[PDB]
UniProtKB/Swiss-Prot annotation, chains A, C:
This is Calmodulin-1. Keywords: Acetylation, Calcium, Cell projection, Cilium, Cytoplasm, Cytoskeleton, Flagellum, Isopeptide bond, Metal-binding, Methylation, Phosphoprotein, Repeat, Ubl conjugation. Homotetramer. Interacts with CEP97, CCP110, MYO1C, TTN/titin and SRY. Interacts with MYO10. Interacts with RRAD. Interacts with USP6; the interaction is calcium dependent. Interacts with CDK5RAP2. Interacts with SCN5A. Interacts with FCHO1. Interacts with MIP in a 1:2 stoichiometry; the interaction with the cytoplasmic domains from two MIP subunits promotes MIP water channel closure. Interacts with ORAI1; this may play a role in the regulation of ORAI1-mediated calcium transport. Interacts with RYR1. Interacts with MYO5A. Interacts with IQCF1. Interacts with SYT7. It comes from Mus musculus (Mouse). One of its GO terms (molecular function) is adenylate cyclase binding. Transmembrane segments: none annotated. Gene3D superfamilies: EF-hand. The gene is Calm1. Ca(2+) 2 binds at residues 55, 57, 59, 61, 66. The N-terminal and C-terminal lobes of CALM bind to the C-terminus of KCNQ1 in a clamp-like conformation. Binding of CALM C-terminus to KCNQ1 is calcium-independent but is essential for assembly of the structure. Binding of CALM N-terminus to KCNQ1 is calcium-dependent and regulates electrophysiological activity of the channel. The C-lobe interacts with KCNN4 channels in a calcium-independent manner, whereas the N-lobe interacts with the S4-S5 linker of KCNN4 in a calcium-dependent manner playing a role as calcium sensor and gating the channel. There is a cross-link at residue 20 (Glycyl lysine isopeptide (Lys-Gly) (interchain with G-Cter in SUMO2)). GO terms for cellular component: calcium channel complex; calyx of Held; catalytic complex; centrosome; cytoplasm; cytosol; growth cone; mitochondrial membrane. The modification N6-methyllysine is found at residue 114. The modification Phosphoserine is found at residues 80, 100. Ubiquitination results in a strongly decreased activity.
UniProtKB/Swiss-Prot annotation, chain B:
Signal peptide: none annotated. Belongs to the TRAFAC class myosin-kinesin ATPase superfamily. Myosin family. Residues 1-17, 18-40 form the IQ domain. It comes from the Eukaryota. The gene is Myo5a. Detected in melanocytes. This is Unconventional myosin-Va. May be a homodimer, which associates with multiple calmodulin or myosin light chains. Interacts with RIPL2, the interaction is required for its role in dendrite formation. Interacts with MLPH. Interacts with SYTL4. Interacts with MYRIP. Interacts with RAB10; mediates the transport to the plasma membrane of SLC2A4/GLUT4 storage vesicles. Interacts with FMR1; this interaction occurs in association with polyribosome. Processive actin-based motor that can move in large steps approximating the 36-nm pseudo-repeat of the actin filament. Can hydrolyze ATP in the presence of actin, which is essential for its function as a motor protein. Involved in melanosome transport. Also mediates the transport of vesicles to the plasma membrane. May also be required for some polarization process involved in dendrite formation.
């Protein structure tokens, strides 16, 4: 289960712009429109396959739970990973894509959501059991989802 | 006066972007860690 | 002492992206970076002054309380955007709210401390500039705020 309630809340906030009737099931052309409004970018062909799954007649609709299911079916194949890669390419002090395990634990001890000992221990464990004091930037994108 | 404010604004803008991304990533990792912790504590019902 | 506990916390959080070891000290190389990030708009010569005020031989390293003392040296200044709208009026031909791209290029690279080639490139890309024309300073200061 990728989901938690506060994710579903923002997806419903976006979907409320389209459910102007309270009907809860959206015609084919809206699917890609909602996804790109949220920021996820499937191609017209990738959308055409997801339309083939539901609309055999030229008039089908997609219920809110199948819309969330289609979003999940297209979760990690996204152009929005490339912005997170960019944030690390800005932050890197050497410009070579590798950061200190000391720097990582220090930043996480002090900044943002502010991670505890067990959360930082788990974050280091999530990268590599073979890690020798240094961490590749892309693995931070890989633990995101 | 103009030059130094543009220099400030460039760094401050990419800093604002970076912080938004980092905090989103940390919130997603904190969900993942909690959903691992939840699996861990259950098997203390069996390590008995 | 010149900052509240909330202000100290905000500045400590930001400083902990540039201090990388958490012992309470920054390199002079990122001192401009952290101050420019924390709302300040310091000149190159003012960074040079603030370092040589602490030590004129030194070690290229500055304590967190000494960094907060540099922030204290700035925070007296009543800085706000209306004086910047007024700063662009000095380069308007008509009073229309507009600086020419040629005059702006002269302003950025002949007068004053001077932006580098990449600071100009980076700004042009962010600003959505197209052709050697003119740019509205009311809209631009709204973006710069």
């Amino acid at each position: 289960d990728q989901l938690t309630e506060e994710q579903i809340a923002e997806f419903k906030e976006a979907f409320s712009l389209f459910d102007k009737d309270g009907d809860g099931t959206i015609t084919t052309k809206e699917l890609g429109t909602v996804m790109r409004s949220l920021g996820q970018n499937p191609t017209e062909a990738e959308l055409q396959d997801m339309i083939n799954e539901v609309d055999a007649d030229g008039n089908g609709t997609i219920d809110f739970p199948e819309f969330l299911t289609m979003m999940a079916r297209k979760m990690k194949d996204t152009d929005s990973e490339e912005e997170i890669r960019e944030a690390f390419r800005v932050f890197d002090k050497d410009g070579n894509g590798y950061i200190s395990a000391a720097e990582l634990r220090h930043v996480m001890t002090n900044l943002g959501e502010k991670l505890t000992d067990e959360e930082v221990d788990e974050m280091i464990r999530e990268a590599d059991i073979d890690g020798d004091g240094q961490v590749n930037y892309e693995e931070f994108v890989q633990m995101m989802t | 006066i103009i030059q130094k404010r543009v220099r400030g604004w460039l760094a401050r803008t990419h800093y604002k972007r970076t912080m938004k991304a980092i905090v989103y990533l940390q919130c997603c990792f904190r969900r993942m860690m909690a959903k691992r912790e939840l699996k861990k504590d259950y098997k203390d019902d069996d390590d008995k």
